[PDB]
Amino acid sequence: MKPMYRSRSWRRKYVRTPGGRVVIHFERKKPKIAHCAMCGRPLNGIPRGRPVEMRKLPKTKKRPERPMPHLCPRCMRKVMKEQIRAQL
Amino acid sequence: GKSLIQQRRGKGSPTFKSPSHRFRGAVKYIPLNYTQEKTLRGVVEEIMHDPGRTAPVARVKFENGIEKLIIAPEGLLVGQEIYIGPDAPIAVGNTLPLAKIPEGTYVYNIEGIPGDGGKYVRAGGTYALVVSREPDKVIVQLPSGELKAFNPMCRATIGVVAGGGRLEKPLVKAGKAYYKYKARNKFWPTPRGVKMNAVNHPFGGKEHHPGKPTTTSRRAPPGRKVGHIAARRTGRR
Amino acid sequence: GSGTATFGKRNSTPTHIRCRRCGRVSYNVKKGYCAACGFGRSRRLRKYRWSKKWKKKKNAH
Amino acid sequence: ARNKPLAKKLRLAKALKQNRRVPVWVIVKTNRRVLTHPKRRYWRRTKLKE
C-alpha cells in the first residue's frame, strides 16, 4: 500500500468486488461524542460524524430542542435555577 | 584542549536548550495595576500537571475576564474562589501585599520587587515564613534558611506549594531517571572528569585521580572552575 | 560498517539541488542557500579570489 | 519519483530528447568526420547531472 495508507489514522477493510477482485477500502475515523461544558459527561441528541456527515443533516437533527444544548440536563437545570434565584 | 559540558551549554545548542514548548506556560501574577487599590475575585477551573515545574498548576478565571495560570497551593480545590488584592481575606490561595500578611504566616511566590510577577518560593513543597513587619521592609525566612527583606508592597500567596515529599521515594531505575531528565532536557547520563582524558578535563588522565587539589579559586577563568568552587571547607563535619 | 554498507543509505533527500540563479546543482535544499553563488543568502554573488571556478567559466585565468 | 515537479520533469525531458544518435545524413554530409556527440547517455551507467 501507499505510505499515506500505511498510517494507522486510516481504517482498512478488505472488500470483495462483484467482479471477484479483492480491494482495500480506506476510511477516516469518526469523531468522538460531544461532552458537557461543565461536568464533561456525554451529551444527548448530537450525532457523531465527520464535517461532511454533519453538513448532510438539517439543523434540528444535530442538537436537542431545549435551551443551552451545550450542557447536560442536570447542568442546564442548575444554571436556570441559579439565574432565576439571582434575579430575585 | 577541548570544551567542557558547562562551556558547551552556554552556546544554546539543542543538546542543552530547555524544551519550552511542551510546558503549560510561565506562571506570573496579573499586572500590578489591577491589584493595586482593588481586589479581584477569581474561580479555579482546572488543576493540571506541568511537565517541567515540580509543582502542579491551576487555571484561574477572574471576574474582569482575565484567564491566568498560577502555582497551585496544597489543598486548593477545583471550583473554589480566590482573591487577589489588599482587601483579600487571609486564606490559602489568596494573594496579598506583604504588608497585609500577619507574622508567622506561610507564603510562597513572593515578588522580588513589586510587580515583577513572583520569583521566590516556587518549587514544589516549599514555603517561607513571615517573621517581622515594618513600615519600610518585611522580613521573611526563605526555604534555604536565609532571612530576606522585601518591600512592603511585594505580593505573595498564602499557603504551601503542592507536591511536597517528592524525594521520599527513590527513583530506583536508570530508566526512571532517563524519563525524568528527558522531560526537561537535562544532561543525562553524566561522565566523570577523572575518567576523562587529559585533553578534556583538568582532572583527566590515564590514572583516575585528580592531579591537583579539587578546590578551585573564585578568580579562575572559564574552562577551569571544576570541582569545589571557592569552597569555604570540605569533608564531613 | 563505514564502507559499502554505509553507502547504501544514500536514498534520502539529496543535500544539493539545482539553483535557479547560477544553474548549478549546489542549492542546499534543507538550509535554503546555494553553496556556489550564495543564492538565498546574499543579494551579491559568492566570489572568492582564492577560487578559480568563476574564472574557468569564461576562460579568464 | 512518482511525484515530480514540473521544472524537474522538463529538465529530464530535455535530457531525454538530447540522448540520441547522430543522423546518417549528417555523417554523410561531414564525410565520416562527425560520428558522435558528447551528450550520449546510458541510463544505467552514466547518470544525469541532476
Added chain:
RNA sequence: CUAAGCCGCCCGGUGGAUGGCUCGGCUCGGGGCGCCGACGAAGGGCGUGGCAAGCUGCGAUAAGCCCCGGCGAGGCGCAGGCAGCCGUCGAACCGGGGAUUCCCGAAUGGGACCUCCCGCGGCUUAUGCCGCACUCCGGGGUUUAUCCC
C-alpha cells in the same frame, strides 16, 4: 630433407615515432578603444531547422522580420547529403537604423523541497494593458494612519 628453441635478413600484421604542413597558441615598442543595469544588466534554464543530435545563432515573428546605403549573381552556419525553396521588383554578404525578444535572475505585487505557482486595486464590453518590493529625496491630500498619490 631433426622436434622445440636461439640469432640475422626479407615480407605481413599491431602500433603510431619521425618528417613535412598549420584557420591555433605565446610575447611585444607603437597606435586604437574602454564601462552595462529598474526604459530590467551580466550569468543561466527551456525552446527554435523538412529531414537536426552537439556547437554556433536566434526567442512562440525563434540558424530569423523591416528600412536607407555598399557589392553585383548567386545563396540556404560549423557541415562535401536528399528534396525543395529564396534571388534581376537586386538576394546571400557587408556598414547604419528599427521590430520581436519565453522563464529564472539586483528580481521588484506575494511565495518557492525544484527557473514553477498564488493575488489586490484602475481602465477595458471581453480579449487585454497599466500600477502595487525595501531605504530615501523633493511635493500634495487625508483617515494623521507614516495611510494614499
Added chain:
RNA sequence: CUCGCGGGUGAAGCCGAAGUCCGCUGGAACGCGGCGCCGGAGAGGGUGAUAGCCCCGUAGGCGUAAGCCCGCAGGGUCUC
C-alpha cells in the same frame, strides 16, 4: 546660440602596371632552356611543383550617410 551657409574629417567601399609566348620533363609548370614587359608596385598569400608580370593584393590615389570639428554671417549675455 545656429532659424542659416561654407569647409575639413568621417562606414561598408572604388580605381590601381607588367607573359599565362615557343621547346623539354612532368598527372598537373610556379621547374629547366629561349624570347619579352612593368616597376612610387621584387611585402605577403592563393592557384594541380618553387610565379614581380594567372588572381587577390602591395607602391600610390579616390569616395563615404549619420556623427564630430572649424569657419562665415547674424542674434545675445557678461567682464575690465
Added chain:
RNA sequence: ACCGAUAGCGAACUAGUACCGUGAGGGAAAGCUGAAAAGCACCCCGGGAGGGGGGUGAAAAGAGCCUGAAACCGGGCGGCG
C-alpha cells in the same frame, strides 16, 4: 633570432566539453585521402562481416585513408640445433 600537435594557453577539434566529488571544487583525450570522389560499376564465393577477380587514379594514398620508425607477433630464407 618564440612553439610547431606529449610542444604552444587546459582547450588548433561539437573545451572549461566529456567525465569525478553531497559539496566547496577538480578536469581530459582527440589535427592531415586525393589535383579532382574520379569514394571501386559488373562477375564468382560467403548467413553475414568480408574474400577473390575486374575497374579509378601519376601513385591505393581505399575512407580502419600523407610518411609508417622502434618494441611485439606470424611466415619464408641462411647458420646452429
Added chain:
RNA sequence: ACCCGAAACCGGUCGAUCUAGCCCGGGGCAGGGUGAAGUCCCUCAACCGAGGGAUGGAGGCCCGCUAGGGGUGCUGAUGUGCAGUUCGCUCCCGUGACCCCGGGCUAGGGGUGAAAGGCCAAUCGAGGCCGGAGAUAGCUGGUUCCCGCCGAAUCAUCCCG
C-alpha cells in the same frame, strides 16, 4: 635559484544522506511461562488461631531462528573476495535506557561523546576543498656528446659544532 619528495603551519570557505547528540511528527515487536500489589471465598474452633481454595495481571521479569536489532567462539570459508569489514555454524537482547523512517538544529581548536581520544560522508591526538605555495631540510634520489693535458683529500683551529 640545477630538478623532484615531507610530515606539518596559516587564511577564507564546504559538509550531520555516514555517524554522535537533541527537537517535531510517525511505523513496529508470532507464541508461551512465571505470578507483585489489589479484591476475596470456605471449613473447624473462638480467649488465641489453624488449614484449604480462588481471582488479579506487575516487572528496564524468564524461554523463544516471529519480525527487528547485536556481534562471543570457531581465531571456520573468503582473504588479486560476492564484499576497500561479506558468508556459514554457534551465541546475545528481544515491552524497553527498545528498533526504524520523514521534517529540523549543533561546523573544525569547533560540534558531539553512558568517556573508547570514540564519531563528525571509505579521512580524525584537530575533517574536507581551494589559496599562502614552486613552504622549508644540514636528509634520500637524479643530473644528457667525444678526445687531449695536469691531477687530490678524509689533517689542524673555531662554530648548540
Added chain:
RNA sequence: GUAAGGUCCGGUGGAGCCGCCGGUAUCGCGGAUCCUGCCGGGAGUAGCAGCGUAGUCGGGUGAGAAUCCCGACCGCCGGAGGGGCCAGGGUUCCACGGCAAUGGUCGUCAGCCGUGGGUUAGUCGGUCCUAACCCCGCCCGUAACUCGGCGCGGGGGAAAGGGAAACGGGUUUAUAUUCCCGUACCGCGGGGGUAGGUGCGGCAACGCAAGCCCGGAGGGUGACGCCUCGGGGUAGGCGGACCGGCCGAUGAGGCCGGCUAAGCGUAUAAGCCCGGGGAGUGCCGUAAUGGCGAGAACCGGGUGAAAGCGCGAAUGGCCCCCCCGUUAGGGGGGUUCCGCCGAUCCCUGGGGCCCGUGAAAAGCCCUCCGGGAAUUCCGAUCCCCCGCGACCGUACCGAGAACCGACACAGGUGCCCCUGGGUGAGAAGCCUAAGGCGUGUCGGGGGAAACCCGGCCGAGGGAACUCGGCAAACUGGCCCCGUAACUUCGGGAGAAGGGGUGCCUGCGGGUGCGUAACCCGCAGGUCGCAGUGACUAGGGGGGCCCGACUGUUUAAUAAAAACACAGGUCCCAGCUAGCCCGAAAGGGUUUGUACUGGGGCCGACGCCUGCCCAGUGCCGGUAUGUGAAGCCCGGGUACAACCGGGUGAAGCACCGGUAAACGGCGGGGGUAACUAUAACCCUCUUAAGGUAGCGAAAUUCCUUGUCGGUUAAAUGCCGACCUGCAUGAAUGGCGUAACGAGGUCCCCGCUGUCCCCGGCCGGGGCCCGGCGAAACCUCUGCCUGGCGCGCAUGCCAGGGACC
C-alpha cells in the same frame, strides 16, 4: 674519422633542404620506486563451486539452438524468491524490425541496437493549516559585511501529522478510482416549490424541515501516552446438503464454480441520561475492580458505533451445455441453504501506571449577543431542476539485473505494508494449495586419483590431546512425583533426581440446546531396538576473583574487571544570583527560583569509614612590612625631560578555619628467659605514626614462601600463617543473594581431542568445448668445500647432469 659523427650506394617517400662565416637557444639521456603512449612473459593459465547444486523428452523457429518458444514430466520458494507501493533511477514501459558491440559461455533472446508509440482526474496526491524550525524588514553591535543578535511586524515550513467530496463493470500492444457505460457525492451560482418570519408533540430525557443577510462572543469537535481485559461485528477458514464439470472403475471418494462496490433508507449494544420507586440481622452486579438516602433493587423510556438488512443488482461477473467451425459467429441453462470456528482487521466500554502527563492551527457543528430587509412581502440546513469547477504528478522497476556501493556487486536502502491447508502453543521447523521461477545463469565427462572445503558413521578406552574439553558430543517438547547450600524472603528453581509418552476398541467429565467445537481423564487390546520415532527440542553440579543488576563502548585485530546507572556525600548561588558563550550587542541554564539550577568524587544492598592542617590548594582576616600608575612636597630645568620624599588598592609577607580538598599515616637497642622467642618497658623523632578490616592478593621481588586438602605424580586451585619489597577505610574497607557470550579450579555424564586412524556423500581439484585476466618479472637459473660487504644458480677447484 681514435671518437662525438660525416658522407655515398640500393629501396620506400612525394616537397622541401643543405655546405661555410658570424650570432643566438626550452641545444645532446639508461636510470630520478621519473612522466605520457604502446607492447611482451605470467597464459589460452586463474576465475566462471561453496550462501537457493535443475533440468529431461517430443515438437517449432532459424544459415546456425544445452541457452529462444509451446506441451508433458521432474524440481525450488511458499510469514517469502509471492501481492502492493515510497524514496531513489528517468524511458529502463509497449509493439515491430535485428545481433557489429554489451550479457561471466552461446544466443534467433534481452533492462542491448534501430524505427515507431505510450502517462487523459471537481472526488487520488500537491495545492490549505500549523509543529520543531527557518527567512525578510525595523532595531542594536561590528572598521565593515554576504557577519552576530534580543524585541516588534510579516512570511514560510509535513506527497506517512490535521485536512470537502466516487464506487462497480468494460476498453488499449502499452493509461486508467483519470477513457466508455451504470449508479453517486462535494463546493459555488441560478430557477420553481415548501418549512419557518406568524408551527407543534412529550412531566422529562427529547422528536421534530423548524425563517434570510452582516459582525462578534462562548461551547463542542478537530485533539492525541503506555499496559491490560470484557462485549459486538466483519474478512478469512472448516464440515454437511443440493445443482453443473473433471478425475476416479460411468465403484467409494477427491477436486473446481455456486459472486455482490460506493451511495441512499433503516437501530440497537455498551456508555450516559430521564420519569416512577423508596431500601440495611442488607440487597444488586462484574472477567476483575465495584454501586447505594449525596437515592439501591425493580417497572417504563431517550440518545447513542462498527455492522446486518432493502434498492443499487443481474441485462453484470463465474461455471456448464448446444448449433454452426473454411474464415468469421449465434444461442440455452444454472448461480441455492444449514452448522461451527474466527482474527494481528473495525466498533465500544472497564481497570491499572507515571518524581515520565503523552502537539498546535486551519476547518466543521451548535448556542448566545448586537445590526439590517420583509406583508397583495421576505425566505431556508427540506424537495425537484439546471450551469460551472483552474494549475502540476500519473509509464515502469520498486530490487540475489531498473536505487546507492566504479558492476546484471551474496552488502545497504525496504521487509516498508499483507498472508490459504496439515502437524503443531506458535508469524517455529517440515510438507503442500494459489502465485512465481528453472536467470541467486557457462555447460559436458568420471569408481577420473592425491589433496581441500561442507556433511554422516565409527570396535575397545574415555580428555591419556591441548596454554585451555577448541571443536564435537550428552541432555532436550509435554504430564506427574520430587527438589539442596545460601538468601536482600522476592529468589535460587525448569536446582538436582525419578517415572510415563505410539496405534486401536470403548466409556466417563467440563462449557455448551446440541450426537456442533475445544479441552481434560479412565479400562482393555496390540506392534517395534527405538512412540516429543521425522521436524522442533536445556547437559548438569560444586569453589574462587571482579563488577550489584537491565544497559553502553574502541564502525574496520580489544565487549571487558572499562563506561553508565539508582543510592551516598561535598561545593557555589536569594535572582541585576551562581556557572557558562561572545569582539560587542546580546544570550544558554530560564515559560526556571533552594523538594531548585550549576560543579566534583564514590557507586545497589549490609556493617563501618580511625589519626594528621607541618607542605601544596581553597576560604576568612589583615594590626604591621613591601607594593604600580595617579596626586602632593622639595631640588633641577627662564619651560620639560630627570632626581629624592609622602599617600599608597589588589597581590604577596603574616594569622585562623578546612582532609567524603591534593596527599601522608616512619625509623634503631633491650627486655616477661616459670628455656628460647615474643610486647609490657626507655631513648632519638615528626603534623601523625596505619585504627576496624583484609593479606604470597588482578597488590609478594626472594617465591614453585611454609603448613593442610585436591592427584600415582600439582610453578595450578582452594583453606590457613603473617616476614604486608610496595594493603587499608568514599582515588572508599570488608561481606554479599540475584545477575554475566568476563578470568579461573574441580566432579558426574559425554564424546574421533587423543591411542590411531579407517570408510561414505555433495562441491572443487582432473579431462573436453567456450569467455578470458591479474599479482609479479635486470638477464638468467644444478651441487660440495672455499674466497668474498663475513649464509653465491652465475666467482675458484672439483662432482653431476640427453631434451
Added chain:
RNA sequence: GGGGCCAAGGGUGGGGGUGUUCACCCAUUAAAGGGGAACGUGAGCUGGGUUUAGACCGUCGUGAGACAGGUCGGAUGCUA
C-alpha cells in the same frame, strides 16, 4: 659397582603442575644421552608467552605519565 678403550647399524618412550626451553616429580623401561642444521623447519600449522592501540592493582612522579612488576582481552595475506 668404580674408572677407561673400540664402536654412531638400531633405540632413547608415556604422564602432573607451568606459555615455558630447562629444572622438579610419577609409573614403567635395556636405556629413558648431550648437541648441529639461519638458537633446522610460520609462501607447513598453532598462537599460550613476549612486544602497539583498551583496562585494573602496587610503587615512583606536583602532572602529563612510567615500571627487563604482575593481571584480562587483543589480526597470522599467496593463482608457483
Added chain:
RNA sequence: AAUAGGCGGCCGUCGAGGGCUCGGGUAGAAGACCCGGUUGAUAGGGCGGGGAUGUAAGCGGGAAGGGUCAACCGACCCGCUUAGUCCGCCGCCCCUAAUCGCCCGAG
C-alpha cells in the same frame, strides 16, 4: 651403463610391426598399463548357482470391543510363504554389440 649391452625371430636394401577407432578392467588425475575383438564367452540378455534382508501384494480366518448385540468397522495376529525384492559375485547358451574405416612406418 657415451665401452649408450646380449640372444632368437620377422622385415628392407611394396613393406615386418604399430597407432586411432570397438567390447571391458588384474589399471588409471591426462598419458600410460592389462584382457577380449567372430582364430569369440569381453559386455549386455536369458537360465541356473551362491548370497543380503526377512515372509511381499491379494484372498480366507481370528481379534480387545462396538454395532438394531444384525449387516458392518476394527490396531494387530495366523495360512498360502525360507516368501517377495534386490545383487558394483560365479557358471552355461553367440540371441545382441565387439563392425566398418582411417593413419604412421625402416628402405
